[PDB]
Structure formats: C-alpha cells, structure tokens
PDB file of C-alpha atoms and ligand atoms in Angstrom:
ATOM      1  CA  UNK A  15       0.000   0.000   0.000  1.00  0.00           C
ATOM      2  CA  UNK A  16       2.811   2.544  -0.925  1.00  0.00           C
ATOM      3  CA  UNK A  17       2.924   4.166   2.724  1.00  0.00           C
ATOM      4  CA  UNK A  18       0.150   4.988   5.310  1.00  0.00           C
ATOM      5  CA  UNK A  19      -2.021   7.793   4.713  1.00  0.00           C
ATOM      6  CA  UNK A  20      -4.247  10.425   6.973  1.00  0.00           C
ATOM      7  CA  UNK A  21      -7.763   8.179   6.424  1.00  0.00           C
ATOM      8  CA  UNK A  22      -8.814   9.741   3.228  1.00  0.00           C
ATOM      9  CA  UNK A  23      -7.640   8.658  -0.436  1.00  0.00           C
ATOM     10  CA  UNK A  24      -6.760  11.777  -1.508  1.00  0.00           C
ATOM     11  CA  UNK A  25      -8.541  11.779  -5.005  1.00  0.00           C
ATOM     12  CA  UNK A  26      -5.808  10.652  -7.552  1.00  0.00           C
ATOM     13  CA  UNK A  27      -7.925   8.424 -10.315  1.00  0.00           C
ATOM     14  CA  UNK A  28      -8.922   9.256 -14.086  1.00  0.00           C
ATOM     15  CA  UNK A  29     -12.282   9.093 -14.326  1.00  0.00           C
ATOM     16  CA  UNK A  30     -13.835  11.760 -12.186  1.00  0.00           C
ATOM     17  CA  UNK A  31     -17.545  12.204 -11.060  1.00  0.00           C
ATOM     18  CA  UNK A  32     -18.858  15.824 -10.350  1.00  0.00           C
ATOM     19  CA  UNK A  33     -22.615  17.668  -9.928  1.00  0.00           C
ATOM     20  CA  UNK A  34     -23.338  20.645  -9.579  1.00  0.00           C
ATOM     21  CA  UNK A  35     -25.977  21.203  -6.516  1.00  0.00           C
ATOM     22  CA  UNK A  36     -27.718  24.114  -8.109  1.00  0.00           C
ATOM     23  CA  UNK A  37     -26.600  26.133 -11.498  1.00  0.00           C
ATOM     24  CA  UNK A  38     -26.802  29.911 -11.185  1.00  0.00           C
ATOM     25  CA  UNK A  39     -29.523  32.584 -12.731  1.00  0.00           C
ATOM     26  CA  UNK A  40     -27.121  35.194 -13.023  1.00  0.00           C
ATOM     27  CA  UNK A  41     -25.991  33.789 -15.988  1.00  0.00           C
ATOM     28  CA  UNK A  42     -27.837  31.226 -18.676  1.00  0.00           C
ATOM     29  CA  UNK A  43     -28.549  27.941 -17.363  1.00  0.00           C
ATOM     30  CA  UNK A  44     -27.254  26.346 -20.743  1.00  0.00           C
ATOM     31  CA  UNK A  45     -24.739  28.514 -19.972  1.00  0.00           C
ATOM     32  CA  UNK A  46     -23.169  27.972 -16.790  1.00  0.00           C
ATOM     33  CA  UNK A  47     -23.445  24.467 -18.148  1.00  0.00           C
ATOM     34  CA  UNK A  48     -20.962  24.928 -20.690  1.00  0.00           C
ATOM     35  CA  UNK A  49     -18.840  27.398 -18.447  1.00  0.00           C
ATOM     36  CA  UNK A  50     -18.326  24.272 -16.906  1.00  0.00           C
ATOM     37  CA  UNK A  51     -17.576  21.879 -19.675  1.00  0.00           C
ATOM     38  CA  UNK A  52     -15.142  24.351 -21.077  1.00  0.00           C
ATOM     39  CA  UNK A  53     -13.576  24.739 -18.190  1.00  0.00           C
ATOM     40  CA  UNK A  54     -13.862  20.778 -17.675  1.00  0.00           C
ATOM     41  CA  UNK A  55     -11.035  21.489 -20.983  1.00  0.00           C
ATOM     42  CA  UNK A  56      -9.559  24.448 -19.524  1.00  0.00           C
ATOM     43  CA  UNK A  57      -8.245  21.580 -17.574  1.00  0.00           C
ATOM     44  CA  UNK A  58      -8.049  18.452 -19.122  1.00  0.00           C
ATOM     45  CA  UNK A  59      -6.470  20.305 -21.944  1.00  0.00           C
ATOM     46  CA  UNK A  60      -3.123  20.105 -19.791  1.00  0.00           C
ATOM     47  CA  UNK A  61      -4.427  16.389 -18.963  1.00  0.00           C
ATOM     48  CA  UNK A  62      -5.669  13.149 -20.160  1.00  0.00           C
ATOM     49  CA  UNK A  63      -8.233  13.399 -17.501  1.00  0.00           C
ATOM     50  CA  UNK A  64     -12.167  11.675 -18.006  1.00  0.00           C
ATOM     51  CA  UNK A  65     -14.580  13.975 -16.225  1.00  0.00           C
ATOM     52  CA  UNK A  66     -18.379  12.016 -15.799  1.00  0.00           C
ATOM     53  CA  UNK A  67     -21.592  14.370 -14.622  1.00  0.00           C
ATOM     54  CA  UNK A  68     -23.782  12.351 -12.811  1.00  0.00           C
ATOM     55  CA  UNK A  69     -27.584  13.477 -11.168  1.00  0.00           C
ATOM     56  CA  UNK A  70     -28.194  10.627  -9.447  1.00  0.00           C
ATOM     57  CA  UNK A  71     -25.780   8.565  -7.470  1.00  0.00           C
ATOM     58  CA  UNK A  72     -24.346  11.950  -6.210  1.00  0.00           C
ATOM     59  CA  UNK A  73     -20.375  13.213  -7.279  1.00  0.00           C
ATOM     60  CA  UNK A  74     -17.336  12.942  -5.600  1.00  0.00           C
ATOM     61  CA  UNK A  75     -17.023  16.643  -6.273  1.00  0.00           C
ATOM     62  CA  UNK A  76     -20.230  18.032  -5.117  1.00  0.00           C
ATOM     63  CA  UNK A  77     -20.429  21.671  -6.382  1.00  0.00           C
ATOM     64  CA  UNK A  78     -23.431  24.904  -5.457  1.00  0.00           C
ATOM     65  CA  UNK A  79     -23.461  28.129  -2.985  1.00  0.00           C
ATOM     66  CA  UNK A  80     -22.084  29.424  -0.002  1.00  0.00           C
ATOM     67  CA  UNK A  81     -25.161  30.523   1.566  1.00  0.00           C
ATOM     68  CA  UNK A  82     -25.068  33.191   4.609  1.00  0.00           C
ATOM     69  CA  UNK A  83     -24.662  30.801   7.212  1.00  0.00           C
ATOM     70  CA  UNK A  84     -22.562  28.001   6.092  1.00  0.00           C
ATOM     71  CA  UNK A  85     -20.390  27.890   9.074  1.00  0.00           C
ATOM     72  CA  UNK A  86     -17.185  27.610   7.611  1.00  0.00           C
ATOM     73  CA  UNK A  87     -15.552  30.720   9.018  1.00  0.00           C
ATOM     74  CA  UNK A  88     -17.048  33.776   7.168  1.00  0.00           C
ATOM     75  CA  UNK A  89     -20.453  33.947   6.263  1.00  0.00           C
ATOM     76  CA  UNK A  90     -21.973  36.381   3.841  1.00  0.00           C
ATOM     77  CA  UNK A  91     -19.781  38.899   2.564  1.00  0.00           C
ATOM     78  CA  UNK A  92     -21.140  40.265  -1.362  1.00  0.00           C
ATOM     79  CA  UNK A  93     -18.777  41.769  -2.837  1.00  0.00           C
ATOM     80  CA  UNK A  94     -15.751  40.327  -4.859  1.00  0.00           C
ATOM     81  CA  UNK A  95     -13.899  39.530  -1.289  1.00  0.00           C
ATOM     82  CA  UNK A  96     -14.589  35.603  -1.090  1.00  0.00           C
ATOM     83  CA  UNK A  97     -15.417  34.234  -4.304  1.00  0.00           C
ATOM     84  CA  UNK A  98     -15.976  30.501  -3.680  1.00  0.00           C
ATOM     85  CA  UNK A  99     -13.769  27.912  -2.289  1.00  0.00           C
ATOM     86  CA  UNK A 100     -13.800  23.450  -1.837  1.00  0.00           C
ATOM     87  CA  UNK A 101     -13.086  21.415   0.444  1.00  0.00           C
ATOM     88  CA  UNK A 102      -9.588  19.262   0.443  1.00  0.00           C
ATOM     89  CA  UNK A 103      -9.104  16.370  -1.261  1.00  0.00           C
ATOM     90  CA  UNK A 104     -11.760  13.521   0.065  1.00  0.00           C
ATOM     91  CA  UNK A 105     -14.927  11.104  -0.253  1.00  0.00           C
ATOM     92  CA  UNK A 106     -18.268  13.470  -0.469  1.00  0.00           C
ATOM     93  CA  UNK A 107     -17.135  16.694   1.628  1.00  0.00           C
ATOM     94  CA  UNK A 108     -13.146  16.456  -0.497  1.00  0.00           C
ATOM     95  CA  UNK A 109     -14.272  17.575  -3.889  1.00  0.00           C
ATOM     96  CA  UNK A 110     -17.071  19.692  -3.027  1.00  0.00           C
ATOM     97  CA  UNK A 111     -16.828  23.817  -4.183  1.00  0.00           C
ATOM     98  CA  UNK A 112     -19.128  26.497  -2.767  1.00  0.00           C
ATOM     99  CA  UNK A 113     -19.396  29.899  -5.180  1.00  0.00           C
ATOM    100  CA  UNK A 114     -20.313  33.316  -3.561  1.00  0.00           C
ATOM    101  CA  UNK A 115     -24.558  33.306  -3.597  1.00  0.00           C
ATOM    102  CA  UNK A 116     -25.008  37.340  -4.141  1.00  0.00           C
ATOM    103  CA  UNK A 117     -22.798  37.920  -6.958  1.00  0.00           C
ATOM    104  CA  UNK A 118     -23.510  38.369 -10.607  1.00  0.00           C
ATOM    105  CA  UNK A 119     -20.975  34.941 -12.605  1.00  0.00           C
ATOM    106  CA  UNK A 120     -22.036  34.357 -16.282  1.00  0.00           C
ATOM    107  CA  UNK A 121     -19.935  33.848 -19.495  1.00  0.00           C
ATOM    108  CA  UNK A 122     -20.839  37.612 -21.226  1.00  0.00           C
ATOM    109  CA  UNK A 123     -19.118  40.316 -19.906  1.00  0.00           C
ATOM    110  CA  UNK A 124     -19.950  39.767 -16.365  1.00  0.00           C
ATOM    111  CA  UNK A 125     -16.989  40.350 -14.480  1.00  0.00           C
ATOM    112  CA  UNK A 126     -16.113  37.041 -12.588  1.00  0.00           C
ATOM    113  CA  UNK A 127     -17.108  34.516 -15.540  1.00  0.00           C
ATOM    114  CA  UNK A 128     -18.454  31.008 -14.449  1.00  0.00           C
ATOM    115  CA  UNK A 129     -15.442  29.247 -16.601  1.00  0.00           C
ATOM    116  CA  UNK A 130     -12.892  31.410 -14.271  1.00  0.00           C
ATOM    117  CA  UNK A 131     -14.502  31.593 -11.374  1.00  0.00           C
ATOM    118  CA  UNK A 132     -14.292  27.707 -11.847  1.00  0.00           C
ATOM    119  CA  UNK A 133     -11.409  27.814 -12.674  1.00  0.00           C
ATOM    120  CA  UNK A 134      -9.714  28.568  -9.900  1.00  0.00           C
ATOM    121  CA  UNK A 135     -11.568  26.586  -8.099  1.00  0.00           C
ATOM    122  CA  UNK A 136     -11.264  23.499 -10.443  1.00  0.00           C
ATOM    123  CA  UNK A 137      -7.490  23.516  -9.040  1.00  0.00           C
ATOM    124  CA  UNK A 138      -8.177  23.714  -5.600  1.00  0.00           C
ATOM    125  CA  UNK A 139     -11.045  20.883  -6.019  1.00  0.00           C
ATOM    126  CA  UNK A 140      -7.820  18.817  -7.291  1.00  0.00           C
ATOM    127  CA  UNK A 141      -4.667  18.778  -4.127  1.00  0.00           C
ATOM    128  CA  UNK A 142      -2.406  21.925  -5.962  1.00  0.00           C
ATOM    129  CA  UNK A 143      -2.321  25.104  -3.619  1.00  0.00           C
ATOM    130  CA  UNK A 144      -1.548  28.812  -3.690  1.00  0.00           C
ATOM    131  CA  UNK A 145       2.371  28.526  -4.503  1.00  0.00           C
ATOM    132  CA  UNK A 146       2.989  32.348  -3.938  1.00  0.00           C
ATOM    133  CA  UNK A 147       3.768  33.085  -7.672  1.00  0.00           C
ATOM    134  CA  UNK A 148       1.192  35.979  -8.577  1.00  0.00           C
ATOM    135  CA  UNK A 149       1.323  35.076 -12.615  1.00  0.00           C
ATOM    136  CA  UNK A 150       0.352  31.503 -11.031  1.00  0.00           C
ATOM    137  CA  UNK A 151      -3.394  30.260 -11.425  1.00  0.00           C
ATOM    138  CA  UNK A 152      -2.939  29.220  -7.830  1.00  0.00           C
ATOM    139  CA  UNK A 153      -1.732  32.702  -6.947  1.00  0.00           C
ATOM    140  CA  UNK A 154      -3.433  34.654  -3.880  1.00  0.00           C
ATOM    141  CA  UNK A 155      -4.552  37.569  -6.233  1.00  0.00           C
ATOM    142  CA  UNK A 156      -7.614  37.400  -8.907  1.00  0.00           C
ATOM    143  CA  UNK A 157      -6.751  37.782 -12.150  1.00  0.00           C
ATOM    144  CA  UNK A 158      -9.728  37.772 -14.852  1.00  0.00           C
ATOM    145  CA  UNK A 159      -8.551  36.434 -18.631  1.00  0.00           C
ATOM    146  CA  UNK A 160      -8.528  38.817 -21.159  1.00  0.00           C
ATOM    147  CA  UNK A 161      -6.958  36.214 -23.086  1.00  0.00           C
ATOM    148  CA  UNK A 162      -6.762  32.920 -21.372  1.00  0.00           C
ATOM    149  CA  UNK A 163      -3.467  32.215 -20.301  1.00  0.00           C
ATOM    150  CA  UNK A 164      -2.546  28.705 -18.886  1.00  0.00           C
ATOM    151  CA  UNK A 165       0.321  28.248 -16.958  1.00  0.00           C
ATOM    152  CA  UNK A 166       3.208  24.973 -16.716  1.00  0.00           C
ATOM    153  CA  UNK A 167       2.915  25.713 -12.708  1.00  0.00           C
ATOM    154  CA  UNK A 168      -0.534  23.735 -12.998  1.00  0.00           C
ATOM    155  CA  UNK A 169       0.719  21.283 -15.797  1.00  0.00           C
ATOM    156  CA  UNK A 170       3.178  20.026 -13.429  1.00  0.00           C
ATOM    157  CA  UNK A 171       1.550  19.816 -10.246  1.00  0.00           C
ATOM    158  CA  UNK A 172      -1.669  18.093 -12.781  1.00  0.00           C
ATOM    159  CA  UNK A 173       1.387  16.262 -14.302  1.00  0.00           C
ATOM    160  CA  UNK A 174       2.209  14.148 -10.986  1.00  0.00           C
ATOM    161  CA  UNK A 175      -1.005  14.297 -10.010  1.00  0.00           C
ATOM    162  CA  UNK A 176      -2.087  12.605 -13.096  1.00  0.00           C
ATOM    163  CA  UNK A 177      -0.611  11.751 -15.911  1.00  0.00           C
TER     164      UNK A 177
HETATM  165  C1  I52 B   9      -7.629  30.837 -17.166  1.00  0.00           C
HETATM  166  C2  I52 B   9      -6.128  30.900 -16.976  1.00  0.00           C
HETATM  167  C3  I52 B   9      -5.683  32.224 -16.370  1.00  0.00           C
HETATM  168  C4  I52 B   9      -5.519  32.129 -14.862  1.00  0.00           C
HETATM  169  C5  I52 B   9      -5.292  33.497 -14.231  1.00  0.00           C
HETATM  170  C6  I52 B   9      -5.734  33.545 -12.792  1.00  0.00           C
HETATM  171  C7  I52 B   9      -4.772  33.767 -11.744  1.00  0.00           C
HETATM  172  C8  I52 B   9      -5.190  33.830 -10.374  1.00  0.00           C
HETATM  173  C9  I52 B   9      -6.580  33.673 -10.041  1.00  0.00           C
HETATM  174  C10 I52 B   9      -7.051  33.763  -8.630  1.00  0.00           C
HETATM  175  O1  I52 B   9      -6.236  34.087  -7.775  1.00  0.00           O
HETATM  176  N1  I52 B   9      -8.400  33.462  -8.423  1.00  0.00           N
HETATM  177  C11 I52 B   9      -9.134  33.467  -7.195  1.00  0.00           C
HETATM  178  C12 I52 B   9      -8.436  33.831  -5.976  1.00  0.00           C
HETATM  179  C13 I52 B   9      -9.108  33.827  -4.712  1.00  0.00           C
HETATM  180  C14 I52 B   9     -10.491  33.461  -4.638  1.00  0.00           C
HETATM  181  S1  I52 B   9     -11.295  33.415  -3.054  1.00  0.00           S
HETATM  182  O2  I52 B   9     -11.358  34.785  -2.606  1.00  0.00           O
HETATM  183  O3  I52 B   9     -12.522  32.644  -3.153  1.00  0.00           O
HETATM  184  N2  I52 B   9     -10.239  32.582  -2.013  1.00  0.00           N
HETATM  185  C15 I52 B   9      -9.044  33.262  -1.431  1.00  0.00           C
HETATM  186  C16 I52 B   9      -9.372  34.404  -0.453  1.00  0.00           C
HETATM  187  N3  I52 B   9      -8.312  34.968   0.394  1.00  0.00           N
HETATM  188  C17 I52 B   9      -7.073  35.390  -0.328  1.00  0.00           C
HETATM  189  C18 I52 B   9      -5.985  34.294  -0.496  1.00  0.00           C
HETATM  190  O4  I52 B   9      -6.466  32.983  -0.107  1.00  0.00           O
HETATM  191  C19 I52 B   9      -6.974  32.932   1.252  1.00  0.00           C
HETATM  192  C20 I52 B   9      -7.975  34.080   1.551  1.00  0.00           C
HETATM  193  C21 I52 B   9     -10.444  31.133  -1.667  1.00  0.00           C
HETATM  194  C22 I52 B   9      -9.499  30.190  -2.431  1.00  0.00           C
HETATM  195  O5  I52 B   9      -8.298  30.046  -2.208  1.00  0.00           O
HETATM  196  N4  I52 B   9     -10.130  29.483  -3.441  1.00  0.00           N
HETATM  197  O6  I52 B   9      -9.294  28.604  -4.169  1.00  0.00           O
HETATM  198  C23 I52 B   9     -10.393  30.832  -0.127  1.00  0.00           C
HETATM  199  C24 I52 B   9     -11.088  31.896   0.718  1.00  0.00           C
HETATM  200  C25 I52 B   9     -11.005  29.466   0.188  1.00  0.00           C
HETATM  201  C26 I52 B   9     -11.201  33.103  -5.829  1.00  0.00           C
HETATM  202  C27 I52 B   9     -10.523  33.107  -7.102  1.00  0.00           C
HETATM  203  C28 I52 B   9      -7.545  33.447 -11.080  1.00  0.00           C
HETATM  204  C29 I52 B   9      -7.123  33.384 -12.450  1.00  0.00           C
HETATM  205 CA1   CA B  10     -18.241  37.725  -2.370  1.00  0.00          CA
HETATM  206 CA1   CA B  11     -16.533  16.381  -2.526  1.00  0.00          CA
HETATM  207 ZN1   ZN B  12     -17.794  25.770   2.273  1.00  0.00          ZN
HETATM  208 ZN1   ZN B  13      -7.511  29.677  -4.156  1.00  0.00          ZN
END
C-alpha cells in the first residue's frame, strides 16, 4: 500500500464524477453548463483526464453556494472579497466547491465569468495550492482572462497528479 495515509484517499484516479448542486440565474442555465464543460477542458487540456456528470448517485465533487450561514468561518460577505472555495481532497465533503450566492458569474461580460470563477476553483477541487507566484493560477490575487493564459505551474503539479 505505498505508505500509510491520513484516512482519506486523496482523489488521484482518471475518471472523475462531479454535480453541480444548483446552477446559477445570473448567468444562462445552458450557460453555466458549458462554463463548466469548457472549463472541464480548460483543464483536461493540460491532462488526459475523463470527467463524468452524474444526477443521481451523487459526485465525488459536489459543487453549489455558499449561503449566509454556512459555518465555515465567514459567512456572507457580497462583494468580490470571497469568491468561492472546496473542500480538500476527500470522499463526499473532499471535492465539493461552494461559489459566492449574491454575486452576478455568467460567461458575457460579467466580471467574474463562471469558466474562471471555476477555474480557480477546479485547481483547488484537485490537491495543488496557492504557490505564492502571482502570474500563477494558484496565486493569492484574482486575475480575470482577457486572453486565457494557462500556466506549466498547474501542468506540473496536474502532471504528478495525473498523468
Ligand atoms: C484561465 C487561466 C488564467 C488564470 C489566471 C488567474 C490567476 C489567479 C486567479 C485567482 O487568484 N483566483 C481566485 C483567488 C481567490 C479566490 S477566493 O477569494 O474565493 N479565495 C481566497 C481568499 N483569500 C485570499 C488568499 O487565499 C486565502 C484568503 C479562496 C481560495 O483560495 N479558493 O481557491 C479561499 C477563501 C477558500 C477566488 C478566485 C484566477 C485566475
Ligand atoms: Ca463575495
Ligand atoms: Ca466532494
Ligand atoms: Zn464551504
Ligand atoms: Zn484559491
């Protein structure tokens, strides 16, 4: 078994099962549907990876709101400020995102962009965390794409992570 681990198999599989607890009216319905998709290649354009959307036997990565209450450790806010954020790696709760509920997300020319927004937070969903570099995708600072810009920091991390 390699080593011993801390309980949970961090996720680490191809293959990956995710579902989306509520889509958002800011934006189109259809459309924060495919601001997910694309950004389901955002990502597995630097991977071989096999994403699966499920509705029924529930997702390893279970995505939706943040709500006021919550009771993470900062509830309600508005504003840019928090954005959305997951859980670590992990079976039900590791995989799960929560996006800021009073905002305005959709793929026109919003501001935040479902597909970034996303993102982001399809890294963090993964194990990869802030590194400190600010032209990172992990970096501490928001940075909207006026041109889509990848960067090889992910590729390698989502190289040993996967392929
Ligand atoms: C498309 C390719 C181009 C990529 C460019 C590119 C580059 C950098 C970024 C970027 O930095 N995005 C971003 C940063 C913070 C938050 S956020 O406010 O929710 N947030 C941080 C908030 N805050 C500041 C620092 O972290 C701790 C506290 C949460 C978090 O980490 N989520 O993962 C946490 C609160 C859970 C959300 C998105 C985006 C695109
Ligand atoms: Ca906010
Ligand atoms: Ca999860
Ligand atoms: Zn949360
Ligand atoms: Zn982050």
């Amino acid at each position: 078994m390699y080593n011993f681990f801390p309980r949970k198999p961090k996720w680490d599989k191809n293959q990956i099962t995710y579902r989306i607890i509520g889509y958002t009216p800011d934006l189109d319905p259809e459309t924060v549907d495919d601001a997910f998709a694309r950004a389901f290649q955002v990502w597995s354009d630097v991977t071989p990876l096999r994403f699966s959307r499920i509705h029924d036997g529930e997702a390893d990565i279970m995505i939706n709101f943040g709500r006021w209450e919550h009771g993470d450790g900062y509830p309600f806010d508005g504003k840019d400020g928090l954005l959305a954020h997951a859980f670590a790696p992990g079976t039900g709760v590791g995989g799960d995102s929560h996006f800021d509920d009073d905002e305005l997300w959709t793929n026109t020319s919003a501001n935040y962009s479902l597909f970034l927004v996303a993102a982001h937070e399809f890294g963090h969903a993964m194990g990869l965390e802030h590194s400190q570099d600010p032209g990172a995708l992990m970096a501490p600072i928001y940075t909207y794409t006026k041109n889509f810009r990848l960067s090889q920091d992910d590729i390698k991390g989502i190289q040993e992570l996967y392929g």
